[PDB]
Ligand SMILES: Oc1c(Cl)cc(SC(F)(F)F)cc1SC(F)(F)F
């Protein structure tokens with residue numbers, strides 16, 4: 001209980017850096033990168049018992065995942081990858097690992113001041129996406 005209280009709420013994207021390069025490293029094709037890179041998603045996080053739900057809503061896609069920490073699940077990503085995901089809490093940071101086709105990417109979500117900071121890493125390439133409360 002209360003594990004993720006500081007994450008819960010509705011958040012809006014305010015800045016993004018290096019997302020196109022992250023998407024390239026992931027393998028996202030040109031047209032999807034252009035459209036996805038323009039998106040300004042909201043992220044809606046809620047908790048009910050042990051189940052965490054994260055929704056991303058934008059003009060590009062609406063996606064939703066529900067999960068229990070440490071318990072793998074299958075996810076179709078906004079760019080249409082079919083991945084195996086596991087999300088854990090590490091020292092207050094939500095750590096989301098996606099595995100597919102022998103590849104891996106990790107997305108970390110953390111609270112910093114009044115922001116929710118999302119760091120997406122694929123090999124040597126990081127993108128930082130900053131959200132504020134809606
Ligand atoms: O915020 C995103 C995150 Cl975390 C992931 C992905 S999937 C990718 F990176 F392959 F593009 C796309 C977006 S932009 C969207 F939310 F509008 F879909």
Ligand SMILES: [Cl-]
Nearest residue numbers: 016017018019
């Ligand atoms: Cl960017």
